[PDB]
Amino acid sequence: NSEQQQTVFLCVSYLLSYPDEQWAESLPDCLDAIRSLDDETVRAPLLAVAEQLAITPARERMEQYVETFDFGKKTNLYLTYMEQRERGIELVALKARYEAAGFAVSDHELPDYLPLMLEWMAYADQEHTTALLADYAGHIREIGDRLAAAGSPYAQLFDALNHTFTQLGVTP
Template identity: 40%
Template sequence: MRILKVVSALLCYPQPELIAALPELTEAIAAERALPRREREALLALVDRLERSELLTLQEQYVALFDRGRALSLHLFEHVHGESRERGAAMVELLELYRRAGFELAARELPDYLPLLLEFLSQRPAAEARALLGDAGETLALLGARLAERGSDYHVLFDALGAIAGAPATLAAIRAQAASEGPDPAIVDMDKLWEEEAVTFLAPQQGGGCPSTGAGRAAQPLQRMPRPAPNTPH
């Protein structure tokens, strides 16, 4: 599902390589038929805004959204497990899923990083990709609803994922939750949290783990593992 690779790229920290690839992404979105027209047009409008904006401004906006606090973290298991032991076990299980499919994690990024997961799913059969997106449907819907509440047009990326996988049955409740939430405590009390909380996972790097936006433009975060050659009779 090529559209998942497009969404993955657009969810990454804006860099010159991404801006250079925007015309290519525009073509891919316009040609995509796995998305309803409304979602395609919304994605095209987002790409148009990225093209018309200064890179530094885009980077500042991205950091303010995704790199400060936890409410909009792109590490999915953080929303499900926090920093508990269960998150570590879920990481191992997801890594094993990548490996069973013949991929090895090459980037210094956690396996639950959403752009990385989407890069993986873009190379899987459509039915499998939809099923795995559906498993994360409530978390994705909550992220999209929080972005919409903040007036960020990044929410259209999550609308697109919902259109592909199907909206969760709890969507109305999720949107109500997002509308009723106050400021992110992790931002309000950031200094206190940094002092008191032990770090249990590697911090994500800006732009790390993101897929290439075109041939040769960036390192691939996922690499196919060579299959062992079958034994041959002597």
């Protein structure tokens, strides 16, 4: 269903965010939201990640987050990093696409930030979400493959993104 996909986008977007103490206040709600997913292919990996984080001290969640998603590594969650001027041109175009679905991109986060893009896809129509996916699915899958090659527990979230994407019509 569509609302199940919205749920996947919201939960992954949240689970890819910096896991400080304020973030953890929503982990119970996130754990319930995940458990309402019917499809085991996306429910199990989302559940594995959320449950592992729930037993991990905040200091270690934040440590591993920074050492996994550092701006220096290729696994950073900003898609235009995979040359500032060309980056900025792409950012102009991405921001215009967001407004094409009826969403005013705030000038406080970069439009290529994966958790932001995921949150947008939970609110956008299938047509706009799929058009965006066709362009950036490759970026997203490569982040997963890099995480998977580094043995990061966060790579499981991307397994769920894969299945969700192929369900929308986006195969690699």
